[PDB]
């Protein structure tokens, strides 16, 4: 009797699964999404409450951007998933509701990460901490910063100060964790609580019989800790008029439920990325069923969605301005992943595939959420060319090959997280790492560890390279070496960050919404891997001479000779970089990691790129010192001239069987550049896409793909006039960011990028 | 290999060793310490600043007494090393300072341990706790009480209601660990930080490689709050304006620094237990020093001892009422390790060791410091003669066989925590476990696992005995099967308790005075051992009928035939509990630990004989319902009859090779019992002891005994009077007790018990 009086009421009309007798998302979905193949025909307006409601939030958007500072942040509060009252922006026109705080955009205090960024938020935003605040977090609750501190070692402290290793998460939260916030729209609180007490109770046995002592005992109230959550959520919902206790009962309480399972994670942690999840299509089942039955319409539907949408332009986190350098554009990450095929060969695109593009017009173009469409030869060619057409009017999506993750999960069921970081939901998450220098990793290996910049010795003691010339085998021999070096300190902070994560800063809201055991990836990211390519490249087909100093420091390099760039499509130098991406993997995959995370990569940046390229000296590959890295894994600026199809199957190229943890990608042409009139741009687009996404047993395929549909002169105007476009939104990593919300410097790297001019 | 001047310098005139080199106290005193075998002819008396804050100290005492609650606590202030200003009695009178709190007697909060409890003593005492304290330890900083009760399983949850196993440290400090407290005044902080940074460092090859990942980020990160805590140590002791960041100089500052590394112990740190150490003999080679010097004259040497072990008497801890009933008397345990002998046949006896004795005359009878003497055949007849005279005296000394530690240990510098843990001072600690219910163990085996006074299912449901007559063959079997689930769950109780205490509240400052790693024992004790024993006498020696109830529940037994009964010297019972010892500890034996604590067993009680007591129904022994068990290791009441000599053999003959955790005995006898005339009285004492702890290779020995000598007469005369004997202090489980202090039932427990007559 696994059917209660309402779950029968709420679920009336919905057909029969395994998921009605467990926690089973993914079967609901199954048994009762309706694929759609039509047009955007049907897509309907904004109503003049959305309309209202989102003017009003630009107001705050703009003082944002202007001031490049929070609209207002907590100054005495420690947040809390019960910590803040209801707050609006107009109570009567919300259909949709809940805010950090109580009020909209004012960020709030997440001390469990560490007091000393907040002090330093105070300090720069102008704001004084209030002392007690300080105390509390200082002497009484120990936090995730000091934890890690008190055990790192000098070396990586070297290696945070050369610019090697630099901006990992060590002071901010982590994140890379989406809870499934479907399950509490599909079967309410009080059955998920039940649920958890089960897992809870299953673990008695190992405990009594000292199976595995400390990993039980740390499970068991991790689990308490989540069971707590929960109960939590309720209350955060009820000072909101609302009782979550049991399943959604229409499309409008789907909707709220999903996000007020989102709120209490956002309004308790400090993930750097906060992703939605994979929400869309589960949503479309409401949203059928009420449309059906005549109770919605379909302008009400969009209203809705509208709502929760621009409940996710609104997530705010209190940053300091070196987490702002690192991470560019005020970002979050509030990622949804839509379409997909299933493995059954139907496509996961539903109509509400569409309402969620929709919001782009419907409210404008916005950088979050983070819309990824999860690409597939097999989608129907109506979503295709509108989906290509909202690039083509916003620039705002961003596109990953569904056909090739999709069989390597072999579940139709996963989520992205944050800008390329694949998850199957409610059962798997990453152990966040930022990013590596790999570039200054080579320059130690010509340097013998000592830092060309700091001219402090960094890395393993050893001979610098002697030649007047360069020898490709040389310099690859002794970067191998140093990589072994990288990877050991990497693995290490990692080691000991995860660590103390897990103990002073659990995600207890997020992980109440995974299954009792969930699968644990360790994700290190490379930073500037077409520097190092080229660099080698030149090394091993030109004539670089290094420059030393009167110690025989090589602080720049000539070069005699053209050589292959990445990017070209030339297996010279492409080879190199498929080459690099593999061997990293090969080592940091030997080493022992924290709760068994299985070691991942990724070829990822963020705002790295820029941070790294100004701690690096002049490279072999020519690059000049301080000059930004490619975001990602972009060829440097400019260097791939040979159009589009070329730099695509450069990229694709890269191995994504090494880098499971993403591959990022930004893609910016030129309008003409993909044809004379929309019709044939859409068209282009997407054929452009199925070739690089094309997947095939003896094919990897592409990963991902942010696309940029500009002008460079766009952006030159935008940057002397701002108050021109309030909205405008550009892929920059593997994430959308409004341009002026970016520092002068950042917009600096964006307009110097390769703009692709033709195909 | 030149000594850092101030080394050099306070370390004038001592004689070299490994001691300079390294953190090594054992060494620093044996190549120092100057051995003693004169009589007491030069102890001085007390001056008249001593009696002056004596006197006004016992104002305080008398309150606490009278009103069986504590003079003042804080209610808004949350105990740290450093969040209390500097206190006194009376500035311009003490040699030695240092108060908890900023008043003398007034206690504080230790949050760190649970929240709850330090609102019950609030609701008990009837006073308001700080709604901000509230808060912090229940919202934002989780405490060892939340971490236990969030893990626990529900049967160890029934157990601890039934009264099996209750009293566990899951709310209160796990306390047994002893800092080795002179280390501060040897080497001064600075000195003791650089060799924790060494440590620290030690760790990070391990780290770097994976090996124990986890075990070694812990200890990283415990040793790095060590080093943090010896920094406040400093500011603590600034406070007072001394300045401990060099090593003593001095007889003085000897005492001082050793007093102020304790003082931070007892200001951060609820333990149930915070003992003293072995310290008497290592602060003798800094007053000989003074006295040869002429620096310091006799009686100045007993003033500084007096100042110090007064402020031991001042130490006080905030309880509730539920903790008074398991530890009765205001219990501290600052515990003192005096005499004993060492390895190299010396004995370890010095002028020292009579000033702390001394300390009884000097300023009356006092339940703290637990001065405990480390007894020896060896020792200076003198000595001898002098310690029983004082147990003569005053009743406040409990004597310890070092004859069978020392050599168990094979080193001479071990201490005793508590009332009888032994353990190598600042190499070895135990993780506290209460006792459990051996009796009630019994009682479960004859009826099925249901309790015999709830009715409810507590032990693993089976069938009870239907036997008219109980056989001992039969209900032995049971009660083996029984033991072995008390045994499991006993453990599973210790392992996550000890878990979360390392989590949320690791005594930094105490950890801090000990190598980098530490010995660990599992410490369980057993209670009613001897209505265990005795009852199973019956069943085997006489006709024990079960008088059951309409479910067939045994709720009372009838004897018929007499029957041995422990205590007596008659191998029939005596054999039955040196069994019953052995197998509990053979099976809590084979238990997977946390940390892998070396499981060990006790045979104490503390006041638990009197909680379990009225917690036990009516058992075969003849004991009737709600009748407190006997202390520790001792006879039920009065049944040891074969006067002095008997009983000692009795429990001498209990294995301390299968309680290594101490086994209690409390003596108790009539002064005429011993002789005419003290002369007699003080020799017959010693010749007692002799045998008692006479120990040859086939022949274990006693472990220890506690000594009054009194008449039952005095102590009804004190019930009626108690104003007439405000220091009255007694032995009553392994510690001593002011006899006002106790309530009445408690007192009613006291008087009750067997009062030897004769030898």
Redesign the interface.
Known sequence: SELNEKLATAWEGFTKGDWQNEVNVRDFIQKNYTPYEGDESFLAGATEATTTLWDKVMEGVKLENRTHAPVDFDTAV?S?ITSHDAGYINKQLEKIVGLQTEAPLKRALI?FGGIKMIEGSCKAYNRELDP?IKK??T???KTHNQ?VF??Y?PDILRCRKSGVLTGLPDAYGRGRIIGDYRRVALYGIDYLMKDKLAQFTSL?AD??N?VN??QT?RL??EI??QHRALGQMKEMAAKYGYDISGPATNAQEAIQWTYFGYLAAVKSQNGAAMSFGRTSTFLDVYIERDLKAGKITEQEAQEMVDHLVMKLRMVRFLRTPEYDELFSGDPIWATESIGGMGLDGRTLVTKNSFRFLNTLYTMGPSPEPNMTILWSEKLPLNFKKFAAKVSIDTSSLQYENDDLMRPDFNNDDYAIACCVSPMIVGKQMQFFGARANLAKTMLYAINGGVDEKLKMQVGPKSEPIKGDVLNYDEVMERMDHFMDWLA??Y??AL??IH?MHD?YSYEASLMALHDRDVIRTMACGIAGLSVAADSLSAIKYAKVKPIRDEDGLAIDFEIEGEYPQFGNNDPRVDDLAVDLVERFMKKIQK????RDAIPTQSVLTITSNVVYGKKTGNTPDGRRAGAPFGPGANPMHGRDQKGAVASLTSVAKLPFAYAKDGISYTFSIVPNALGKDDEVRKTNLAGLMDGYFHHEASIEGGQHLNVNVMNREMLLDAMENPEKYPQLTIRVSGYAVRFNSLTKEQQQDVITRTFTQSM
């Open positions: 420690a809390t001390p007690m509390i977090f002497e009484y609750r934890g008190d055990v070692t008695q405990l009594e000292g002592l400390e005992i068991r109230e308490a800790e050991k300190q693995i290490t080691n000991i660590y103990k080493l022992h990691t924290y």
